[PDB]
Ligand binder design. Sequence first.
Ligand SMILES: Cc1cncc(-c2cc3c(cn2)cnn3-c2cccc([C@H]3CNCCC3(F)F)n2)n1
Length: 273
Amino acid sequence: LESQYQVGPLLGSGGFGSVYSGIRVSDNLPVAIKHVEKDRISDWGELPNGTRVPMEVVLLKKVSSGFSGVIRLLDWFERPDSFVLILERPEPVQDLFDFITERGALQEELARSFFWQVLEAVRHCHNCGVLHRDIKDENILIDLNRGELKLIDFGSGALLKDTVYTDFDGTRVYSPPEWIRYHRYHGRSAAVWSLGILLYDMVCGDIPFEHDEEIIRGQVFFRQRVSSECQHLIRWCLALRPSDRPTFEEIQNHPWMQDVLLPQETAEIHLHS
Ligand SMILES: Cc1cncc(-c2cc3c(cn2)cnn3-c2cccc([C@H]3CNCCC3(F)F)n2)n1
């Protein structure tokens, strides 16, 4: 590992572990190098050859093919007390949290492009049998040259199933009222809730709910000027009853979602500066 990759600066660390910038030696390919302590892994999976491995590795492999809406796993290594994941790294890049912090509330044309791409990426995960469980601005990277968005951090994820989940380790302020109240949720409708939070954050520059009681009440106040169509879509995603939330098809067919820009157009108009 140490002879295959040159490690650069720490990009970030937290509950997910530590993530470093790196370069693949043979290639000069930019990579990210993620370390997770074994004692901090609660979800374990099995490789097709029967090897004990973090579920995150299983989810990443299921998701890591041609589609570039998800940051792909390139390699992985086991150490005595940790696992090391080698992930693709776009350059230049900025996560959506930082982007919104710097720019404030996004213009709706830009939010539409970004949200659409996140939907396509989440649909890809679900099609591969993977539930992300921590969709949020911090877990989305923007390839600033290509205008392409990429999902990161499958450390909180799960195999997608059609029955109830009773565990959750994603971000609480993005979690749905059914989780808060009953400690149970279904995968897709919980994902749509978090998408509603994400969309609100894009067009308002902050999340709509801070405390559990706000989530449970589910009343959405807009603190910035937001179009009626966008407001409608957000309020639909944030329906209290999960079965009242839109399907992915319904979100993408929503009037607010029509005429999305291509990623390169998005970059040329909004990112190149
Ligand atoms: C938080 C987290 C957890 N698990 C994996 C990754 C992760 C980050 C990545 C890449 C792959 N995985 C590739 N690039 N990259 C990256 C590059 C620049 C900045 C960031 C930020 C992502 N949000 C958290 C802070 C950060 F790491 F600087 N990530 N991040």
